[PDB]
């Protein structure tokens, strides 16, 4: 049983020592990434039916 | 084009095969076998003939597929719903497990663990209509055990003398008084042992009654 507890303690120690950035920077990064690829999302902004593979398009 | 017709014909053949396979499987009688490791399901399986085990056997031109999931040993709450629709649930309980205890916990009789499992599955939201066959195995050994030992071990409350028939009836009653869908499902009990040679016939009769009742309730006469 001591081995399990030692493993858990060492794992917690390894997980505690990591460089974390403030939540503001991560929020800004997510916002910026979502904004950069906004025009490339078919689901977000509907695309004209002429280029929709499921409404009216040419297959082969 | 030619490729389009080829693909459509492939799809049509696949649909034909799927329909055939489905209609063939619909005639199967699917049973779910359950019980502790020391219940005696090994003997029941041997008489009727890693992961999940499947036994196929025929009787009176009737095909039975029995699924045994005893070797899972994980949280049952995640996969039990995969068996919603089986014709019936066979549940084995060793009658000689009343004066014994589990080797893991402190003083928890195996009879009480079997009772807990029965109460859990019988009253499960996924098996409201499914019926349960209840095998009460190891009757020959139970007779001798109770002839020498008393029954006040696991059942501190017991009104009656120590005799095989009385104790067997009391245990059957205690196990049948655990289901709350007394009007939606029916329990079929049977005292069996290593030398019975009639358990397959009991299962056949139980499945016959289950199918007849299902048809009658679908018609509207039950």
């Amino acid at each position: 049983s001591i081995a399990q507890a030692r493993k858990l303690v060492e794992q917690l120690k390894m997980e505690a020592n990591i460089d974390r950035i403030k939540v503001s920077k991560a929020a800004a990064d997510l916002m910026a990434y979502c904004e950069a690829h906004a025009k490339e999302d078919p689901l977000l902004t509907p695309v004209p039916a002429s280029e929709n593979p499921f409404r009216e398009k040419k297959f082969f | 084009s030619a490729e389009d017709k080829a693909a459509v014909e492939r799809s049509k053949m696949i649909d034909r095969n799927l329909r055939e396979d489905g209609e063939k499987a619909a005639r199967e009688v699917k049973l779910l076998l359950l019980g502790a490791g020391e219940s005696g399901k090994s003997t029941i399986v041997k008489q009727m003939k890693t992961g999940i085990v499947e036994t196929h056997f025929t009787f009176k031109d009737l095909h039975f597929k029995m699924f045994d999931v005893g070797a899972q040993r994980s949280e049952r709450k995640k996969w039990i719903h995969c068996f919603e629709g089986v014709t019936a649930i066979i549940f084995c309980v060793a009658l000689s497990d009343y004066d014994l205890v589990l080797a893991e916990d402190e003083e928890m009789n195996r009879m009480h663990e079997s009772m807990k499992l029965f109460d859990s599955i019988c009253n499960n939201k996924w098996f409201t209509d499914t019926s349960i066959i209840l095998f009460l195995n190891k009757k020959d050994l139970f007779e001798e055990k109770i002839k020498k030992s008393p029954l006040t071990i696991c059942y501190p409350e017991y009104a009656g003398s120590n005799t095989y028939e009385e104790a067997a009836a009391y245990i059957q009653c205690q196990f049948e008084d655990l289901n709350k869908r007394k009007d939606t499902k029916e329990i079929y009990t049977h005292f069996t042992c290593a030398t019975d040679t009639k358990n397959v016939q009991f299962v056949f009769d139980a499945v016959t009654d289950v199918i007849i009742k299902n048809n009658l309730k679908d018609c509207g006469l039950f």
Binding site: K25, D29, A38 | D21, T50, Q72
Partner: protein, 338 residues
């Protein structure tokens, strides 16, 4: 000793908690104040796939964004072409109890598994015929819950025995094992670069694993019950988790905390699946109420709902091109939405 180790561990846990707290400069909702809303997302059903005679349990899209797979309890694994809806392949399974599927990035192999505790890999271009069982990976002691290819050789799977495994298909041997979950691992998601992967378990926690060293780098908590689904953000710097608590949660890797919670008072069922959009702005989540809700990933608002199934939505996925969304259900039908 016992209490010695437990007390130093609780001290380390308090240290980690305080560290996470100190790094909380502002909420995602406070930075997303002026972002324009998304607007009512009306998505209609375009194609419907019939042919399964039982409840579908999993599906996965192909990297080409046209072919897809679906496994059902009838013992069938069907590969469909969504553009025409004509079944391309139908594979019978040695075990009717299947719970996951997977499509190789190259499209040369498919994988499945379930209560048989085996990952079956089938080849689709064998040499002369249609389909043949290529490999059977049997090293788990619990049901196989999820699996995802890394290449034509490596494959990572999760099982109910509270462990994940990385197998070398050519050899059929666990090249690596991931342990640390105290509950059944119910799902996993590979990162875009295939260097890491997150896994959610029934212990109400998620873990980030490295595929090379094979250690746990970060643990994420916050849920109250089992996690049933998990997905990576398009840039691999975050992920989303759905649980039985009727709530989704967005976790960040660099910050190591919870960013946003997507829930609603009118939602009590459990979340069955989750997925993102090509831009990551939308978060689609298939629930147990027979519906599928589309949430805003930056404002935490419900914008749209896909309601076309009779039974619960068991699986849900989006295409690489991001042109449609496939959803399966226990009612034996798959639907493509656009």
């Amino acid at each position: 000793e016992l209490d010695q180790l437990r007390q130093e561990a609780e001290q380390l846990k308090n240290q980690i908690r305080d560290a996470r707290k100190a790094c909380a400069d502002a909420t995602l909702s406070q930075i997303t104040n002026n972002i324009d809303p998304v607007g009512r997302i009306q998505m209609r059903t375009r194609r419907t796939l019939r042919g399964h005679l039982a409840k579908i349990y999993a599906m996965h899209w192909g990297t080409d964004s046209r072919l897809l797979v679906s496994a059902s309890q009838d013992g069938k694994l069907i590969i469909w072409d969504s553009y025409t809806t004509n079944k391309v392949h139908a594979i019978p399974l040695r075990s009717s109890w299947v719970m996951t599927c997977a499509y190789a990035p190259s499209g040369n192999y498919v994988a499945c598994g379930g209560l048989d505790n085996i990952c079956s890999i089938y080849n689709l271009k064998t040499r002369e015929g249609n389909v043949r069982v290529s490999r059977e990976l049997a090293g788990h002691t619990g049901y196989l819950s999820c699996c995802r290819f890394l290449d034509d050789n490596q494959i990572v799977t999760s099982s109910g025995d509270t462990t994940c495994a990385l197998w070398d298909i050519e050899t059929g041997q666990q090249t690596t094992t991931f342990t640390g979950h105290t509950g059944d691992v119910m799902s996993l998601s590979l990162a875009p670069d295939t260097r890491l992967f997150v896994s959610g378990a029934c212990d109400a926690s998620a873990k980030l694993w490295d595929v090379r060293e094979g250690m746990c780098r970060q643990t994420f908590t916050g849920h109250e019950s089992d996690i049933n689904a998990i997905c990576f953000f398009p840039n691999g710097n975050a992920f989303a988790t759905g649980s039985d608590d009727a709530t989704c949660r967005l976790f960040d890797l660099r910050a190591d905390q919870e960013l946003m919670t997507y829930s609603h008072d009118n939602i009590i069922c459990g979340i069955t699946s989750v997925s993102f959009s090509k831009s990551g702005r939308l978060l689609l989540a298939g629930y147990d109420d027979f519906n599928c809700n589309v949430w805003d990933a930056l404002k935490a608002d419900r914008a749209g709902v896909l309601a076309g199934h009779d039974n619960r939505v068991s699986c849900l996925g989006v295409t690489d091109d991001g042109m449609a969304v496939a959803t399966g259900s226990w009612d034996s039908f798959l639907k493509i939405w656009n």
